[PDB]
Amino acid sequence: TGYDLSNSVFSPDGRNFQVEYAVKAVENGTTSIGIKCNDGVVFAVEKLITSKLLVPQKNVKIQVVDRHIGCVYSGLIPDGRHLVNRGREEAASFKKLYKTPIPIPAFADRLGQYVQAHTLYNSVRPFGVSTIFGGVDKNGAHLYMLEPSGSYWGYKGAATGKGRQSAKAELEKLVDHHPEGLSAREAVKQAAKIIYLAHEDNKEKDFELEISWCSLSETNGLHKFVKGDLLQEAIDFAQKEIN
Amino acid sequence: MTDRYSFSLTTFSPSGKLGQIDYALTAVKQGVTSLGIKATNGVVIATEKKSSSPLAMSETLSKVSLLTPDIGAVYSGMGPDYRVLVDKSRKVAHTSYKRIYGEYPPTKLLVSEVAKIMQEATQSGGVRPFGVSLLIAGHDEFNGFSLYQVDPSGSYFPWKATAIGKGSVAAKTFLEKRWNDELELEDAIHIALLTLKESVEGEFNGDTIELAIIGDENPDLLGYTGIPTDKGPRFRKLTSQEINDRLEAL
Amino acid sequence: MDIILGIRVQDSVILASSKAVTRGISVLKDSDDKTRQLSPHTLMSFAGEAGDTVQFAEYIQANIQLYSIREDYELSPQAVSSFVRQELAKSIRSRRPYQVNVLIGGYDKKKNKPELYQIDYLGTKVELPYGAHGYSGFYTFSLLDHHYRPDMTTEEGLDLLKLCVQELEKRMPMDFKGVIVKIVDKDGIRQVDDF
Amino acid sequence: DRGVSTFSPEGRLFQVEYSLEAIKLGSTAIGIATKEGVVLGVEKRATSPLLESDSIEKIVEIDRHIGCAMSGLTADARSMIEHARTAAVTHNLYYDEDINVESLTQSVCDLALRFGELMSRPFGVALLIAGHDADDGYQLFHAEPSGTFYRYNAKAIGSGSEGAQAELLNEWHSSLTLKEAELLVLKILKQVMEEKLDENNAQLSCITKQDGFKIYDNEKTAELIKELKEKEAAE
Amino acid sequence: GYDRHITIFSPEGRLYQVEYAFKATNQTNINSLAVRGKDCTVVISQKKVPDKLLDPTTVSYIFCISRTIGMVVNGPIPDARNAALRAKAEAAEFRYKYGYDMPCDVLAKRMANLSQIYTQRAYMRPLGVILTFVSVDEELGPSIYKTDPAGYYVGYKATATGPKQQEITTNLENHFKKSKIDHINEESWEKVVEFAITHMIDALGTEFSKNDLEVGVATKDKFFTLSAENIEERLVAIAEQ
Amino acid sequence: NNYDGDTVTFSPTGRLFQVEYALEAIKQGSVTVGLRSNTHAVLVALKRNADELSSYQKKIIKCDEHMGLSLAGLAPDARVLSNYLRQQCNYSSLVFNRKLAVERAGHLLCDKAQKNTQSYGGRPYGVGLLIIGYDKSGAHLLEFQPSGNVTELYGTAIGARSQGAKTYLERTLDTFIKIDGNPDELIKAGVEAISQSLRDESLTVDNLSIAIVGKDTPFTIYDGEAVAKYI
Amino acid sequence: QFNPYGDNGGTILGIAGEDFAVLAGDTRNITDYSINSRYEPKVFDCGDNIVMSANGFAADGDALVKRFKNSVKWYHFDHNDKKLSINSAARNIQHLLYGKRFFPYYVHTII
Amino acid sequence: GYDRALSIFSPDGHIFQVEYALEAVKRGTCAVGVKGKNCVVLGCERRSTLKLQDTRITPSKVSKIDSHVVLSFSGLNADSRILIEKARVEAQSHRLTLEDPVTVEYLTRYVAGVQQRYTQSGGVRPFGVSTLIAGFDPRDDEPKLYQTEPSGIYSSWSAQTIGRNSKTVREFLEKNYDRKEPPATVEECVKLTVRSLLEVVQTGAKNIEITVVKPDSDIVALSSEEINQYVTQIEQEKQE
Amino acid sequence: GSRRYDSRTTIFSPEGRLYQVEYALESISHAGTAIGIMASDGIVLAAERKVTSTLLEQDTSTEKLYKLNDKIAVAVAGLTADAEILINTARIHAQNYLKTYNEDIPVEILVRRLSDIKQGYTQHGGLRPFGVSFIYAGYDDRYGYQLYTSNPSGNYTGWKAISVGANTSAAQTLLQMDYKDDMKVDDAIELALKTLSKTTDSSALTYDRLEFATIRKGANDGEVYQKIFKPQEIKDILVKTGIT
Ligand SMILES: [Cl-]
């Protein structure tokens, strides 16, 4: 034993226990999700209201990369911010050299290789975040989910954090019941519902819903936050479904 | 990041042993038997092509390697460590010698340069020693034919004949009885094939044996004509057919 | 600075070096000693660009004095001159070269021989019976060629040196305000206070 | 082993807490700030009678308006003094004025936590920095290897510190004269010192606006010791 | 016992981190196979999409390294992509510097030398992957060269990698013992892919749908991966004889 | 236990012990309170002395004309972080002729604190900060933790016994938020909040430290007889 | 060849009274024979009851004034809000200017 | 580069590597310094375990730093060469810039500073060496004798000893050295130095080295026979 | 991080010893014995090759005696590979000194330089020390014939006669017994070989298990000649002295 004390050390299994311990921090965090729709993607996150003193709508968790990519994560919030800061540098240098904005699959590997790099050495710690991200590029909509190991795949729906099993079950129903596809405005409503259903795992404290989206029709392919009437409409829809 | 291992991983134990060097020699002991025999008009180096799978093409894996036109090398121990050493050995033969003096290094000096690389892995920060013992056979104008062994420590010794790896103890005893100072190259090749048969279990033929010589100049292998002083490489790898021919007279 | 001479006689080396220090228009000093003692039996005179001359001389002095302490031993004049030459030969390909010419007069206590070395700013070393830098040689060498003998006494060397200085005072346009003369022999280095 | 900059479970830096233990072993140094000046005094503590005690330099000038006393691993203080002197002179060069005592203290304290894996460990010495400036008048600071500095009306550091500090607690008031402070340092030093206090194994100094920072002669201090003995015998 | 944590020799003359990296290789539980035709080199690999939420088009362990070189990986996807990106960079630089397309075997050696460095230098860990490189080389013809975490590499007539490699290896061994040739004597790559899939079915004892496989084909001057419908067509032909 | 030797090591339950120990240093530190209305933001800090001869450790640091913070924990670390903020505020002014947004200041502190938690050799910051400011979107109050977590709040408190002041503010939320255009009443609410965290000791003239920033109010600190009004 | 300097013209005037001081300057900014601006402020209040003007090449003038104002700000931070005396300001400006000895601020500064 | 903090604090407030460097000094051969009225004498033990030595070429225990200052030591011999070299360089650098040779105090302060730097620098261990530095300041006839040690503390001494059995010779010197009247002549000072070594040395043959430093760069090392005369006279007076 | 695996080669024990230096010396105590003996008219270097084979090519072999310049040579005891690193450094230092001063390097200056390098590996860098002890045999016009030794600590000392490697305790006693100051090279040759013959762990001392060298002013007039003995010449001197 001692294989779990240092990062980048293979145990006799062939496992890197430090990465698996980073996963435990991710599992401890709040629920975040992603939904791929017809012409775009929808992100949503559970924000735990620790106290009444928290200013509503201010501690924004979802982050934009470039103008067309949305990133959300569960786990150690600073680690997620660090990863997005890198993502923005990657997306900036891509656009600088190649003119076109970074494609989503291209962007996904930039994050992937960076997170994987933090499993190669004992002088660094793995990322304590699963990141769900995506957007609209020239080849259409893309949703990705990136783990502490550097592992990522494309997704129809994605979920991570403390309510991930609850969320995943709900996402699987949507995939089955909508083979032809889901619209952007539908996905916003469903995202609101799924976060509300996934809130049963963090039921002690009440929460604040936050949603964002990229959609070719609804937002011109750009990332925008769901605000005001459209947000309240999704909250009402979500509140109706739990009761 | 940064290589934060700036300290030695090989250190002296209370008994005065350098543990990692001893363990590297243990790894060499587990490796497949290779040998070298020096004759009056040539040197022969030989080893068993231990194929990891029958689907693998063992011709692609070269255990016997040309370092310079007149110098060749064979090993026992860890193949990957040998492969990078051959790359470095070829390069150093150019950078620290040919690009200065306009000619290839003599066997002993190239050996010295290889030995230096292996010693540095025994003292430098954040590395283990190389897990190979080399046998370097070669010729140069002023020293003639020579055969050297190089160990993980970086220590090198000149030999008339020797063996390393799996069945070295038995093979060295076999060579001691057969070797004399009047051997011709063909006699040395014959003894090499006899000695190497003792350590090989399975198939024993030109496809499972690798064998090269440092002998006469090969003007057919030079690739060009018109310069009288350039007469071609003394290193020559024996073909699968050439080995089998000599196995009939065995 | 201007005029530096050197002459090796039977049992000593004599170095004559001007006293004038001119800054374009005015003569700022008429008593400047353009020499440094490197070791008890080795003296270096020098001439070249302002600042560089003294900086270089003192740098050499410090290095030889450091060697003398470390080994508890005086380097031979040949060894010191070779060290000095290398420093100048290194200097000439630098970003800003030392613009300094030197004479190294020394008495080798091992061989019991005086030795004069002339080294210019390029690192061009020559051992000589008599030497000079700059325009000094042009006036004096014809006199030295004629009168010099290898078995001369120190007193004969000084007389020949007076004749060289007199010729310089007659035919040179610059007033170099006379010379400080120093003798390097078996007993060490001393200054001829009346010249 | 473990990191040099490691936090303990209580929320303290191990190395900083251990350097504080080294300072407790050091010789006693006492500072007393008054409206007529600040007085700095130290226990020399020679390890043998053959050691020429006047060579023990535990009180040091930083500038004309700032003095400094030390306690602990006194060799560590040399680079701190050098920095303090350089900071004091450099500020005068840039601003054509004396540097504020606090600002000097802050500059010294910025070095303290520059250690890791910069230097390899914290300083093993505490400093009493005493001075005067036009803005805040006579000041006494206590600079630790944690990077923290506290201003004090009076302060004792070293092996007899907590005993001396309790004594300073009672004795200090805002209307002390310089002569009263001098005797008070000598009194408390004599109390906490192992060996009997005299002019050779204890040193005094002060900083006044007029004369600046001055280390006291052994002849001058001897008179203040004799003056102390008589005034204690007087009741 | 720190001789098992970093890449230094144990008393036995063994590198335990290298051996444990070989065990990380089978963590995906995927079996790959590579075979050579006359004009082509075919590589097939099991595709397992366990989660329904996954976009199955993005689940791939086959990579297009250069126009001519393809690579399949046995091991975790982060290390696989680490290797893939590097091999792409190396292939591109090689073409720029030396004026011709990087051969499959040279790339395999270069990647193997990199993997050797991680076995000697302590700060760098080995990648827990086995890289099987495939091409139709302009000099050597159809080529399969495989690299592991030990920094070992060798050319192959055919090969197999994964948890059930031995069953596949022996199946292939027995076929080449009959035919007595170093390749699949077949004109079209389509039939060589059919051979590959058939002999994986026989070795593993499992039937495959179009979404259970992943196929890569190397021909002269291009390497390409088959779509689900291209594989389906392949599976139809197998079933009809 | 075995996973607290450095910051680079996760525990088996996914915890960073060195960060948690740095967090502990804040709880040992003296209490400080932050609260705001729509017009003004206020810091109230209980300063701590070594003994009766010593001065009271300053708790509040000014970062710009429109921004500043109160500290709790290692004061040198607050000096480093406040100096970083001063520079970032200053860079925003010099380059963009733009006062730095309080939210963006929090984001910068978060990211600076994060790099220390992922790399080998270094250590986490051992200090908690309460940043107040007035920018283009009105009054703000942030809570910085050296884990990296920065949180915008109406009111809060950090340090020893801070839970008492934090409960009081949680009750008073609806009252003090409405104290617009009245700095003295907002300070009174802060002074009354910090009073809930006191035991044995009470607020004296050289013990209390108050700062305020607002609409037409630069960040100004009040110490000594300037805070005698509020005692 | 690129010439990094320019002449923006203008004229300034400082006069020290017994208990006061004035620093005047025209508001015209020019290049060659053209007027750039008829009102471009040249004399600036830098805080701490100090006024400053760096006349000549306006870009270097604006740069220096900007840096001194910044020096005043950091003087307050580093030294407990102490007032920067006019003599101290002057010495600080010497170091700013001399800092670019070998690529000067092409300005005549008056405070 | 190798950055590892080797010299660090322990829970009890000690830097063990500095303290273990002192243990290396305790192992080293005894060195002694005694200053008279117009001279300083540096005595040094040579352990007689090593015979068949070439005493012409073997590194002498006392080293000249400049023509007016000397340095002896106890502890690791290899380590002492590094300090001596640095000191010698600084002595010539001081002459070059200040146009005046080092004071004995200055030279000591430099060597002590170097020793200190090695106790809080990454990747390095402390010097296992204590030194005795002695000499006369330029144009000054007052004798100077200083001591340094691995920690970097230094101080001046009327007389002092370092190395193995230094406790015994310090005991001797503490009763035999009078401050009010130090050894008035060179003879008296050398005699007291030889006497103090004879408490520890074993045989008074080639095991004692003596170096006498006088004002104005007058440094001479005594020969075997000259020292042997002191050894003879001391014991003949002792037989009474 | 990396700290976990750091042996810490450059630290003091509680007793004030350098662990790695002590263990390096223990390593050297198993190496083949090398002996140096200085006479009035020259120096002798004799050294024992370690358990050789019959198939070792002895005439082209060099494990013990190396040439630094025309005036100075060294006998090695310990890791041959480590010694060769240091030997090439020393060879360069000698040529650097020659280039700078146009005079051959004095023996002690070369010895000090090498010894300072070894010292560096014990005080800083975190690397293991060189597991080598040298005997330096050399001549210069200042001190004449000189014998020195250096070891992994970087400490060096001068000698009239000295042994390094195996059985030095026994060897040094035998040398101390038969050595005299007025001795000559031919006598020193005999003493060196007699000492090895008695201290050797082998059954008998033969030509094939020895390297041998002499630095002599036995060169035509005032100059010095290094003679690295050939296998046949070592065989001849063994018969002459009466060992075989
Ligand atoms: Cl390569």
Numbering used by the authors:
A (entry chain T): 2 to 244
B (entry chain O): 1 to 250
C (entry chain X): 1 to 195
D (entry chain R): 1 to 117, 125 to 242
E (entry chain U): 2 to 242
F (entry chain S): 3 to 233
G (entry chain Z): 1 to 111
H (entry chain Q): 1 to 240
Question: What did the paper state?
Answer:
Upon the FDA approval of the boronic acid containing inhibitors Velcade® (2003) and Ninlaro® (2015), proteasome inhibitors are of enormous public interest due to their potential as anticancer therapeutics. Hence, the number of studies on selectively and specifically inhibiting the 20S proteasome core particle (CP) has grown exponentially over the past decade and confirmed that some pathogens modulate this fascinating multi-catalytic machinery by small molecules, which have originated during evolution. Thus, besides peptidyl inhibitors, a distinct class of proteasome ligands has emerged: small molecule β-lactone-γ-lactam natural products and their derivatives. The chymotrypsin-like activity of the CP harbors a spacious S1-site that is particularly shaped by the hydrophobic amino acid Met45 of subunit β5.
Interestingly, similar to SalA, the homoSalA derivative inhibited the chymotrypsin-like activity of the proteasome in the sub-nanomolar range, while it was two orders of magnitude less potent towards the caspase- and trypsin-like activities. Therefore, we elucidated the yCP:homoSalA complex at molecular resolution to investigate its mode of action. Inspection of the experimental 2FO-FC electron density map displayed the natural product derivative covalently bound to the N-terminal threonine (Thr1) of all six catalytic subunits owing to the high concentrations used for crystal soaking. While the active site nucleophile Thr1Oγ opens the β-lactone ring, the positively charged Thr1NH3+-terminus acts as a Brønsted acid generating a C4-hydroxyl group from the hydrolyzed β-lactone. Although reformation of the β-lactone ring might be considered energetically unfavorable, Thr1NH2 is well positioned to catalyze this reaction, which supports the mode of action of homoSalA to act as a slow reversible CP inhibitor, similar to what is observed for SalB. In contrast, the side chain of homoSalA is stabilized by hydrophobic van der Waals interactions with the aromatic side chain of Tyr168 in subunit β5. Moreover, the crystal structure of the ligand complex reveals rotation of the chloro-n-propyl group from extended to gauche conformation, which is required for possible cyclization. However, while the well-defined fluoroethyl side chain requires only a modest change in the dihedral angle to achieve the final conformation of the five-membered ring, the C4-O→C-Cl distance in homoSalA is approximately 4.6 Å on average and, thus distant from the required geometry and position to form a tetrahydropyran ring system via the preferred SN2 trajectory (i.e., a chair-like transition state). In case of homoSalA extensive hydrophobic interactions with the cyclohex-2-enylcarbinol moiety stabilize the ligand in its bound state. In contrast, only few interactions between the inhibitor’s P1-site and the S1 specificity pockets of subunits β1 and β2 are observed, resulting in significantly weaker inhibition of the caspase- and trypsin-like activities.
